[PDB]
């Protein structure tokens, strides 16, 4: 019945430095358990009974704490450690997990690359028109999209999907797609997708015209 809060929610650390992750319990807890989950894979046990390590766990992970405050410490951050980490408790059945500390790998500031695509003739045949705007290779994850039709902003019918952090260059990529009807698409001419990133206040602008 105990509620476990893991802090912070999103971690950003560079390879080769000390990493301290913390979990906090509502009331007194006797033993703590930690779990690692890499993207697209089953979770695994790292630490059991507050401090002891599981078999197969590399010598860099450490755990400590008591009562309400507990910590998982990584002495030296490695590339294969970029994963989500979870709190785990008992002596209160349930038997609950934490929110999940997402350890993300640090990268030097990256600027997004934008490519806007007009709706295909095959979709315009069916009666639908989806304008796809690709936002590729940027750091960090947080970014804002703004669809502008003839200057006026559009909010409904927008689809936004992000990718997980890349294993090679450690950058994020997202796909922005606005869905419209054949009638709604042909009424207007200019279509713009704007990217508002932390790297620059000036929006990265890619646009096209329908009549052309």
């Amino acid at each position: 019945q105990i509620v476990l809060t893991q802090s912070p929610a999103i971690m950003s650390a560079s390879p080769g430095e000390k990493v301290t992750m913390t979990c906090s319990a509502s009331s007194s807890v006797t033993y703590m358990y930690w779990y690692q989950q890499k993207p697209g894979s089953s979770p695994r046990l790292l630490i059991y009974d507050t401090s002891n390590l599981a078999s197969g766990v590399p010598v860099r992970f450490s755990g400590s704490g008591s009562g309400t405050s507990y910590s998982l410490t990584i002495s030296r951050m490695e590339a294969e450690d970029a994963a989500t980490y979870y709190c785990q408790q008992r002596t209160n059945y349930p038997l609950t997990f934490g929110a999940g500390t997402k350890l993300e790998l640090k990268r030097a500031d990256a600027a997004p690359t934008v490519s806007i695509f007009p709706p295909s003739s095959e979709q315009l045949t069916s009666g639908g028109a989806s304008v796809v705007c690709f936002l590729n290779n940027f750091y960090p994850k947080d970014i804002n999209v703004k669809w502008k039709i003839d200057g006026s902003e559009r909010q409904n019918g927008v689809l936004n999907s992000w990718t997980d952090q890349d294993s090679k260059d450690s950058t994020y990529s997202m796909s922005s797609t606005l869905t419209l009807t054949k009638d709604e698409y042909e009424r207007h001419n200019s279509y713009t997708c704007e990217a508002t990133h932390k790297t620059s206040t000036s929006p990265i602008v890619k646009s096209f015209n329908r009549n052309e």
């Binding site: 929110a99 999940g100 690709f134």
Partner: protein, 218 residues
């Protein structure tokens, strides 16, 4: 050694029931506790219950009664979990888990993704995405392949039958009223396109579809 195999995905309409299994090997099944965990997109891990086959002990999470009924087959070999109710709330990844006594887990199963939806199995579409009329800025050209309106997951998207893989960003699908929408981007130099052939290939096992779409210049 210790392996907990469980089926890929189950797709069942609201109201009806599902029987999940977990083929356990690498250890003595009747010795260690078997636990079950539910994981949702952005809500975290939720523990359901656990069975000891010994000594038959069946624990449950109070929030999961009586949505889950846990039983164990011992011959053969597996641990069973029946979900009775089935609602849109139930749509999640369900994990098998081994543990030595209450209440922590050593090894986790492959995980079965359960999708509770009234939607029917449907074939994909596949559309070619070509750059602006004229030329692309710089030296690197960007191409795309849009797959709209398909159920269920997944779809295998490969460029040039498997000859093109470098600089490819495949974006995860999103639910849009019963049918999924997936997109993928590829970045190559201007000396390769449109001098050489580039084709996006999509296959859907649930509908037996094989689409090869060539990106023609506008």
């Amino acid at each position: 050694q210790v392996q907990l195999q469980q089926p890929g995905a189950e797709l069942v309409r609201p109201g009806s029931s599902v029987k999940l299994s977990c083929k356990a090997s690498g250890y003595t099944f009747t010795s260690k506790w078997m636990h079950w965990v539910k994981q949702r997109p952005i809500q975290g891990l939720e523990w359901i219950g656990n069975i000891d086959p010994s000594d038959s002990e069946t624990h449950y999470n109070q929030k999961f009664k009586d949505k889950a009924t846990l039983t164990v087959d011992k011959s053969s070999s597996t641990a069973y979990m029946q979900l009775s109710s089935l609602t849109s709330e139930d749509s999640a990844v369900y994990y098998c888990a081994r543990g030595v006594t209450r209440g922590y887990f050593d090894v986790w199963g492959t995980g079965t993704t359960v999708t509770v939806s009234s939607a029917k199995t449907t074939a994909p579409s596949v559309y070619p995405l070509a750059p602006v009329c004229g030329g692309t800025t710089g030296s690197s050209v960007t191409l795309g392949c849009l797959v709209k309106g398909y159920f269920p997951e997944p779809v295998t998207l490969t460029w040039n039958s498997g000859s093109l893989s470098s600089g490819v960003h495949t974006f995860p699908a999103l639910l849009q009223s019963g049918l999924y929408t997936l997109s993928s981007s590829v970045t190559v130099t201007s000396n390769t396109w449109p001098s050489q052939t580039i084709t996006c290939n999509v296959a859907h096992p649930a509908s037996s579809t094989k689409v090869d779409k060539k990106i023609e210049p506008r």
